[PDB]
Design a binder for this molecule. Structure first.
Ligand code: HEM
Ligand SMILES: *[C@@H]1O[C@H](CO)[C@@H](O[C@@H]2O[C@H](CO)[C@@H](O[C@H]3O[C@H](CO)[C@@H](O)[C@H](O)[C@@H]3O)[C@H](O)[C@H]2NC(C)=O)[C@H](O)[C@H]1NC(C)=O
Ligand SMILES: *[C@@H]1O[C@H](CO)[C@@H](O[C@@H]2O[C@H](CO)[C@@H](O[C@H]3O[C@H](CO)[C@@H](O)[C@H](O)[C@@H]3O)[C@H](O)[C@H]2NC(C)=O)[C@H](O)[C@H]1NC(C)=O
Ligand SMILES: *[C@@H]1O[C@H](CO)[C@@H](O[C@@H]2O[C@H](CO)[C@@H](O)[C@H](O)[C@H]2NC(C)=O)[C@H](O)[C@H]1NC(C)=O
Ligand SMILES: *[C@@H]1O[C@H](CO)[C@@H](O[C@@H]2O[C@H](CO)[C@@H](O)[C@H](O)[C@H]2NC(C)=O)[C@H](O)[C@H]1NC(C)=O
Ligand SMILES: CC(=O)Oc1ccccc1C(=O)O
Ligand SMILES: [Ca+2]
Length: 595
């Protein structure tokens, strides 16, 4: 007895059915089932949700009710006893650049987003939750441990609000609570253009027929464009330095300004759209604005898909790549392209790949300025360092020259994120991303670690000795058992990230399975997949294969020296070469004659 009635809270509209361009909402990708993969709908469930009361309450909500007979440990204790570490030396990935971490975040924001719940416009819940830590409704505070240093200095808890769900959003009940995915599931560059008709429009430059995206008018970066500033005050980007008063950037995705390197990436993409746009006009002068926008937009969509599947996943999945994502075989209308709820947690392996600092390099790739190496935490929502401290070129050079942080069982998430994370809504640099993650697993009703091992057809340890063998680490297996009392209770996020990495990969067996299935699906169930005959012509595909992130760089910055394989670790100057030597995207294949 199914129930696929519920739904209304979703911007719907008619379909075109022979239109060459994706919709902004993702609707109409699948002809037989039009809303599949669309934005503002529930994340798919690969396994039933698991809640304390079976419907909506998270485990750890009612301190008396246990999970399989035990209390589930506070997310912060787990963070404190397993995730943290003090010594940053020797933690860098010797063969993965900072861009490896950054691209990952870009693909993830393109694929999923479960925003937190409102009712908080002119609200005291917004305060009944941070001031008094009173658990209730959408307020599910992260309590502090005994002997936590934040006690003495911050309070009794860390505010936290539950994720939005479907049908309603206020006081609801009836079916199992399913979270929302506010963005399109397809890998379509929805982070550049937006996932709603409203925002998509406001991002475009409609005062002219060039099909360009709107750009900043207050500042330019050596003639090159900037994303436009965001309208909305109070702005968090101006709170971190009230004297600079530089607001956050307005982009296709709302998280664009979490960190300076994510804003740099967004800007690089924006710039490529315009470039691509003024170039296409030049070859097809008659084309109107719409045509220029959609056509460029589609090129860029094909760009992200290529870099992701050709250069990124192969070094995440490693030797497991082929076991999950076989050679492409054409569009399969039976494949469900929805992002699963658990994927949004599996893709968080990236948080353990973020180093403690971000550097800026001058033209010889040497420290730019005296205070060239900044601590990550000073850059959450920091837009002023771009506008008033050198533009994006210095940051992009750091992306190519510095390394990512290597995931390590005894050194998982840097303190820059574990103790000094900054939230919009709040006023301090004192949050814990690791604790938030674990708290979010419960909020989302995730099955335990062993449910997912079974799902992926992997052994399921029940004993300490069993876990030691799987983690291949006596001590970690030990800390994990003392806190969870059973491997069945280990949250998927930490459980999955504690496994050793597969050959040539950066994730373990469980994650490779979870990541692998998701990408196989978004590819096979995407009617607009770039390799799908009819989407692009044979001659356009031969052109799209030469796309390189190195090139993207060359055409949108004043960097003339770039690595050929920007994801592996490269040393300047030996592994860098003049832009004049890098393949360029040939657009002549897009020229459409007449008569
Ligand atoms: C600061 C943060 C980052 C780097 C300095 C960072 C980075 C990543 C990478 C590199 C990811 C994948 C390769 C990735 C995935 C996901 N993130 Fe994370 N991220 C930073 C900060 C945050 C915060 C805060 C959140 C929200 C947590 C919450 O539950 O409230 C966050 C989330 C996620 C996320 C879940 C997305 C969703 O579907 O709603 C990823 C898949 N990141 N990040
Ligand atoms: C640092 O990481 C690099 C990438 O993981 C790695 O180099 C890669 O090694 C693989 C070995 O399989 C090779 O991959 C390509 O091999 C041929 C090209 O000759 C292609 O037809 C294949 O499809 C495949 O893409 C490459 O040699 C290289 N891959 C890339 C994309 O450059 C380095 O070995 C790592 N460094 C160390 C010290 O381990
Ligand atoms: C808030 O943003 C301010 C910039 O808008 C920043 O100060 C700026 O940064 C330094 C001061 O440390 C100055 O630049 C340096 O270079 C000039 C070159 O002309 C030299 O004269 C000095 O050595 C100078 O330090 C900027 O001029 C300065 N701008 C202003 C208005 O002060 C603040 O440090 C930021 N505050 C925080 C807390 O981050
Ligand atoms: C929309 O596009 C127009 C045309 O490209 C932009 O107008 C130009 O702006 C730059 C710098 O201000 C200069 O070349 C001229 O002042 C304008 N040229 C023309 C032909 O108008 C305009 O800035 C864009 N609008 C937004 C909001 O980004
Ligand atoms: C299209 O995708 C479907 C759905 O994933 C594939 O279906 C599987 O095919 C086998 C063999 O026919 C069925 O017995 C299974 O029930 C399906 N598995 C699952 C998990 O649904 C199908 O193989 C794909 N077809 C093509 C031509 O690619
Ligand atoms: C980065 C991520 O996914 O987070 C955010 C998005 C929008 C606004 C704030 C944040 C954050 O919590 O730092
Ligand atoms: Ca998308």
């Amino acid at each position: 007895s199914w129930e696929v009635g519920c739904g209304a809270p979703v911007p719907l509209v008619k379909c075109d059915e022979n239109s060459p361009y994706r919709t902004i909402t993702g609707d109409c990708n699948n002809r037989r089932s039009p809303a599949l993969g669309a934005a503002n709908r529930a994340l798919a469930r690969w396994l039933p949700a698991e809640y304390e009361d079976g419907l909506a309450l998270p485990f750890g909500w009612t301190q008396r009710k246990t999970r399989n007979g035990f209390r589930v440990p506070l997310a912060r204790e787990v963070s404190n006893k397993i995730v943290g570490y003090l010594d940053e030396e020797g933690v860098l990935d010797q063969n993965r650049s900072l861009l490896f971490m950054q691209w990952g975040q870009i693909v993830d924001h393109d694929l999923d987003f479960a925003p937190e719940t409102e009712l908080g416009s002119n609200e005291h819940s917004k305060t009944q939750c941070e001031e008094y830590c009173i658990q209730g409704d959408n307020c599910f505070p992260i309590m502090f441990p005994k002997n936590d240093p934040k006690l003495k200095t911050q309070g009794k808890c860390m505010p936290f609000f539950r994720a939005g769900f479907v049908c309603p959003t206020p006081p609801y009940q009836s079916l199992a609570r399913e979270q929302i995915n506010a963005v399109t599931s397809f890998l379509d560059a929805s982070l550049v253009y937006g996932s709603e008709p409203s925002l998509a429009s406001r991002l475009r430059n409609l005062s002219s027929p060039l099909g360009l995206m709107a750009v900043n008018q207050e500042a330019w970066d050596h003639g090159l464009a900037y994303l436009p500033f965001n309208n909305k005050k109070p702005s968090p980007c101006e709170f971190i330095n009230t004297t600079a008063r530089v607001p956050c950037f307005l982009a296709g995705d709302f998280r664009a300004s979490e960190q300076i390197l994510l804003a740099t990436a967004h800007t690089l993409l924006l710039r490529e759209h315009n470039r691509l746009a003024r170039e296409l006009k030049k070859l097809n002068p008659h084309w109107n604005g719409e045509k220029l926008y959609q056509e460029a937009r589609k090129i860029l969509g094909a760009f992200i898909q290529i870099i992701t599947f050709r250069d990124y996943l192969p070094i995440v999945l490693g030797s497991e790549m082929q076991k999950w994502i076989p050679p492409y075989q054409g569009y399969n209308n039976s494949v469900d392209p929805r992002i699963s709820n658990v994927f949004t947690f599996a893709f968080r392996f990236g948080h353990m790949e973020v180093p403690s600092t971000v550097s800026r390099l001058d033209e010889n790739y040497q420290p730019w300025g005296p205070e060239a190496e900044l601590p990550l935490h000073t850059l959450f929502f920091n837009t002023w360092r771009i506008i008033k401290d050198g533009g994006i070129d210095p940051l992009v050079r750091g992306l190519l020259a510095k390394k990512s942080k290597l995931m390590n069982q005894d050194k998982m998430v840097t303190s820059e994120l574990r103790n000094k994370l900054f939230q919009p809504t709040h006023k301090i640099h004192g949050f814990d991303l690791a604790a938030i993650n674990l708290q979010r697993c419960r909020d989302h009703g995730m099955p335990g670690y062993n449910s997912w091992r079974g799902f992926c057809g992997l052994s399921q340890p029940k004993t300490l000795k069993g876990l030691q063998t799987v983690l291949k680490n006596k001590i970690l297996a030990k800390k994990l058992m003392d806190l969870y009392k059973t491997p069945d209770n280990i949250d998927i996020w930490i459980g999955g990230n504690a496994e050793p990495m597969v050959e040539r990969g950066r994730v373990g067996p469980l994650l490779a399975c979870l990541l692998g299935r998701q990408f196989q699906q978004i590819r096979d169930g995407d009617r607009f997949w770039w390799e799908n005959p009819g989407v692009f012509t044979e001659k356009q595909r031969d052109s799209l294969q030469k796309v390189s992130f190195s090139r993207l760089i060359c055409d949108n910055t004043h960097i003339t020296k770039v690595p050929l394989h920007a994801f592996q670790a490269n040393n300047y100057p030996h592994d860098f070469v003049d832009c004049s030597t890098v393949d360029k995207l040939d657009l002549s294949p897009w020229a459409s004659r007449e008569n």
